[PDB]
Amino acid sequence: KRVTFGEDLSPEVFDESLPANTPLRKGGTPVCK
Amino acid sequence: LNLDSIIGRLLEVQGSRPGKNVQLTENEIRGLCLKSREIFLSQPILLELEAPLKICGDIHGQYYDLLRLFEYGGFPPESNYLFLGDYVDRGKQSLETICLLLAYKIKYPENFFLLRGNHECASINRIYGFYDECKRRYNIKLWKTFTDCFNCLPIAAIVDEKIFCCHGGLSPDLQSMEQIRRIMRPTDVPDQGLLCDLLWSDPDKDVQGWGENDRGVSFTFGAEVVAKFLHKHDLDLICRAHQVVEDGYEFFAKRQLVTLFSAPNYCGEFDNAGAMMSVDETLMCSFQILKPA
């Protein structure tokens, strides 16, 4: 059981003036290899 | 202790205009400290955690960014969480930050974990904001209550016997994990020793072995030190925080060490993004980044 690294994920973009539950762009979610 | 009422009020500002405070009562916060302190002491000082899990770096009182991190990674108990310390100081809302994390710790004691950072120390948070925030919004007595709670925080964690987690880094005094387990709680952070290094030491590319740290506290360590440590304890990765990085995360010594920082636009003096390491059941580590516009 060794440590590996997944693919790069699109970052969740947010605005500081906007509510925490309403990001500008939803970020990527880790998926299977 | 009405934990659900506390969490509810803390999460209530999720869709509100950012910046507004959540003012809990003195007794509610004191209750959070007392119960969490009990759980911290009942659980090992060296945690043995299992994947899947999400690991976060410094938060530093940036409460609304913490909500954004949960908005991205999933609010508990949807996901497991391990924080590497530094929840207070520098930010404008250290109280809201630590209260939610302590509430989640009490609410989900087996799926939510908090490590001790160097800012979870009375001598440190006295200076960099937390004391002033307590004196302003509550009282000095409550600050001492937080101190008594911080002194019982676990120091390190190991994920599936492969990922070693701490706030700072390695120590020249660390030959066996037993030395960490032998550390008695409650305790303050000393100016020197194993406990000091685990919360203060940093990796350094230009250092062969161990060197002096420019902070004036603890040490620096090179890539060879990391490699020897992993091989000796059959580990694959060191996961730490303690240092602000532009992309929110940064590898060291050929992906044998990673630094996590989860506070984007760090106290209005940086344009850095925040990041978070997601570890699945196969110990495959992904990096979820919270990036400012």
Numbering used by the authors:
A (entry chain B): 391 to 423
B (entry chain A): 7 to 299
Provide the publication's sentences verbatim.
During mitotic exit, PP1, in particular PP1γ (PP1 isoforms include PP1α, PP1β, PP1γ and PP1γ2; ≥ 85% identity between isoforms), is essential for histone dephosphorylation, nuclear-envelope reassembly and chromatin remodeling.
We confirmed this in vitro using ITC, which showed that the affinity of both Ki-67496-536 and RepoMan383-423 for PP1α7–330 is ~four–six-fold weaker than for PP1γ7–323. Deleting the last 15 residues of PP1γ had no impact on binding. The change of only a single amino acid, R20/Q20, switches PP1γ into a ‘PP1α’-like isoform (PP1γR20Q; KD = 2239 ± 124 nM; ten fold weaker binding) and PP1α into a ‘PP1γ’-like isoform (PP1αQ20R; KD = 199 ± 46 nM; similar binding to that of PP1γ). Although R20 does not interact with Ki-67 or RepoMan directly, it confers selectively through its interactions with PP1 which order the L1 loop. Namely, the Arg20 sidechain forms a salt bridge with PP1 residue Glu77 and makes a planar stacking interaction (cation/π interaction) with Phe81. Remarkably, the R20Q mutation abolishes PP1γ localization as effectively as mutating the canonical RVxF motif in RepoMan to RATA. Together, these data reveal that the isoform specificity of Ki-67 and RepoMan is not defined by residues in the PP1 C-terminus, but instead by a single residue in the PP1 catalytic domain, R20/Q20 (γ/α).
